[PDB]
Amino acid sequence: GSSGSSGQKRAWITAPVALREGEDLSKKNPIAKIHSDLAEERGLKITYKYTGKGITEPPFGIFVFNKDTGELNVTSILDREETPFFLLTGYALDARGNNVEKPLELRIKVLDINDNEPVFTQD
């Protein structure tokens, strides 16, 4: 929908992923993807992991990620009833496996079927 049109700066910045439950979200994907620039700059294979509801905690079989491609795709239909919210964290470990750059607080909210979110601006 909107990555980041207006902000303070373009660096290690993330946006609140907003998806509507119901159908299979097998289109928007990838819906998220984080990585260190030093990777493409230098040419190292950075590792990415995700911890939270859907991966480390049930209901299992919700979110899947791979360090080979470095992407996040949903393999299950979201639901406000079962999971009203989804908390996940992104880690950028180096070839060695150390936390060189603090992780990210990726938050994924679940909008109802009739998502009627209000309209406003951020200054």
Curated annotation (Swiss-Prot):
It comes from the Eukaryota. Palmitoylated by ZDHHC5 at the plasma membrane. Residues 11-121 form the Cadherin domain. It is found in: Cell membrane; Cell junction, Desmosome; Cytoplasm. Expressed in undifferentiated pluripotent stem cells, expression decreases during differentiation (at protein level). Expressed in hematopoietic stem cells and circulating endothelial progenitor cells, expression decreases upon increasing cell lineage commitment (at protein level). Expressed on common myeloid progenitors, pro-myelocytes, pro-erythrocytes and B-cell linage progenitors (at protein level). Expression in mature cell types in the bone marrow and mature leukocyte populations is absent. Glycans are attached at residue 73. It is linked to Arrhythmogenic right ventricular dysplasia, familial, 10: A congenital heart disease characterized by infiltration of adipose and fibrous tissue into the right ventricle and loss of myocardial cells, resulting in ventricular and supraventricular arrhythmias. Interacts with PKP2. Interacts with CTNNB1; the interaction promotes localization of CTNNB1 at cell junctions thus reducing its nuclear localization and subsequent transcription of CTNNB1/TCF-target genes. Three calcium ions are usually bound at the interface of each cadherin domain and rigidify the connections, imparting a strong curvature to the full-length ectodomain. A component of desmosome cell-cell junctions which are required for positive regulation of cellular adhesion. Involved in the interaction of plaque proteins and intermediate filaments mediating cell-cell adhesion. Required for proliferation and viability of embryonic stem cells in the blastocyst, thereby crucial for progression of post-implantation embryonic development. This is Desmoglein-2. It comes from Homo sapiens (Human).
